[PDB]
């Protein structure tokens, strides 16, 4: 007979990517879920149900976090065929937002704004969205609504030549003499993507090279263990001489061109380095032409 209806969701894995193709489904962190809020529109994008769901039980359904399931109380009959969408980690102005959206096309109008938009003001849990259209007279079960992260990760693992592998000052575990910027990242997280994502830029430093005061020293968060899933990390050899540099940092979808890191890195003098050239040297690394959500860009280079 008529029967209440079941949504199943999961967290869709990264799509990894460097010089092709992997899926990761990352740490728990990356994948961690605490509130949900679902949208029921009808076949016209209209008239959407909705649930914001923060524990086990709310009014009109219950959440089974480890199995992965929504039960709403909403029968088949009542519901026939939905455009569904879940959202995943909400804050409140993105619930807010959801709150008032009327038709699925003012989806991809829901944002969040972060004024330093990478790590680690980007941090889990991570807003993520899916969406399903599913006819639950035919089927009170909806298996499943992929979940996909709307940040993207970029991962640069730097090997040293030997110009480059100086013994480096460390403060409080920071490589003081080696520097980084990020510029032209977006401010945006949009819940869904519009088809074309407009600009909303800033850069982490404002210096432009060779004026590094203003960028960020080389941190040892990624030394540790175990370690964060973000950060900035190096290794030195048993003489202290610095080999290696890595740095991750989760960043916002783009669709334009222009997003680049930036870093500053001091070099040996072997005693003929001229006086008026004494300083680090600038390496750039422009990221993709369009950055994806849930998407993980390595990067392993020799400098």
Request: net charge negative.
């Amino acid at each position: 007979g008529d029967r209440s209806i079941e949504i199943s969701i999961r967290v869709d894995d990264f799509t990894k990517t460097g010089e092709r193709y992997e899926r990761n489904q990352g740490s728990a962190a990356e994948r961690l879920i605490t509130n949900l809020y679902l949208l029921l529109f009808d076949q016209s994008g209209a008239n959407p149900a909705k649930y914001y769901i923060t524990g086990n039980t709310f009014t009109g359904g219950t959440w089974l976090p480890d199995d992965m399931k929504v039960k709403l109380d909403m029968t088949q009959s009542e519901a026939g065929e939905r455009k569904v969408y879940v959202v995943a980690n909400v804050d409140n102005a993105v619930k807010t937002a959801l709150d008032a959206v009327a038709n699925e096309s003012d989806l991809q109008t829901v944002k969040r704004t972060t004024a330093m938009p990478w790590s680690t003001d980007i941090a889990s849990p991570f807003l993520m969205s899916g969406n399903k259209t599913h006819d639950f007279l035919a089927n009170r079960l909806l298996d499943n609504v992929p979940l996909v992260r709307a940040i993207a990760k970029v991962e640069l693992n730097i090997s040293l030549s030997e110009k480059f592998q100086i013994v480096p000052i460390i403060v409080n575990g920071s490589l003081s003499e080696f520097k980084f910027r990020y510029v032209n990242f977006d401010k945006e997280t949009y819940v869904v993507k519009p088809t074309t994502k407009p600009d909303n830029l800033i850069s982490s430093a404002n210096g432009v090279w060779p004026q590094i005061t203003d960028w960020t020293v080389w941190g040892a968060s990624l030394n540790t263990s175990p370690a964060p899933d973000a950060g900035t990390g190096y290794t030195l050899d048993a003489n202290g001489k610095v080999t290696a540099l890595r740095i991750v940092t989760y960043l916002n979808e783009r669709d334009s061109k222009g997003a680049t890191v930036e870093v500053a890195l001091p070099r040996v003098d072997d005693g003929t380095l001229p006086p008026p050239e004494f300083g680090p040297e600038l390496y750039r690394l422009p990221l993709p032409d369009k950055i994806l959500r849930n998407h993980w860009y390595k990067y392993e280079v020799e400098i």
